[PDB]
Symmetry: C3
Subunit: 147 residues, 3 copies
């Protein structure tokens, strides 16, 4: 599309290799959407919206060196009161951080101490025993009196 | 790629010999590298887990879940060390005649 | 593809924006496979393998 007096390429469909670029090229000559079928790389400078796709391997990648590579439901952050699942490595502390639950009941790991402000239940073949009650430190003590 | 959303995942063995597993780059099963490894080993047909590093790790080989890491479990009264909690501290008595 | 006496679009490759639709458009004007590179959305009314 011709702006001012210069033509800026908006897309380029290569006949020889099939490489496809979409959008206005940035200062580095890379389109916001780029296709490289020689290497088969889906590199887009944006967000992807879809529903269901299968996969095996995942890498939490820090693209710009400052973004936090983590998984979160929409509207869910680290340590917030919102209900959701948050799992990732905090770049400031270089520690994997976990946040599953809500404001009241949650399971959180900050990379150092795994604290759970939720009912932690562990099962046995004889049944289920409350972990909090199981380890309340109930000590059988004796008190003595002379009479 | 960097970020794509999804709901359903299948660890698929395409050629019948590749191990369908998830791993960070440079991370394998049982290695000393820090990372997360989760998948089913085709040789043993057992799901294998490897989260942590050479010293502190949480590993499951499909048979025994062993953790060479500080396992902490929380209670409303606070946090009690699981290793100290189950050290088998038995109140024993020794008797002497005098 | 012309069915009966009306042409129903099967694909549309937009030159200006690069938007690509694949398949027979439904009642809402959305193809079963739609590409929106302006928004970069992979929205398909089906399954992905």
């Amino acid at each position: 599309m011709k702006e001012g007096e210069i033509w800026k390429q908006t897309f380029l469909i290569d006949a020889a290799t099939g490489a496809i670029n979409i959008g206005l090229l940035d200062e580095e000559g890379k389109a916001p959407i780029s296709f490289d079928p020689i290497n088969r790389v889906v590199n887009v400078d944006g967000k992807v919206i879809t529903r269901d796709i299968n996969a095996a391997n995942f890498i939490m990648t820090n693209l710009s060196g400052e973004d936090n590579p983590a998984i979160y439901t929409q509207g869910k952050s680290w340590g917030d009161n919102n209900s959701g699942i948050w799992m990732g490595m905090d770049n400031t502390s270089a520690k994997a951080k976990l946040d599953i639950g809500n404001a009241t009941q949650w399971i959180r790991y900050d990379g150092d101490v795994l604290r759970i402000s939720s009912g932690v239940v562990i099962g046995t073949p004889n049944g289920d025993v409350d972990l909090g009650t199981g380890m309340q430190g109930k000590q059988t003590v004796f008190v003595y009196k002379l009479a």
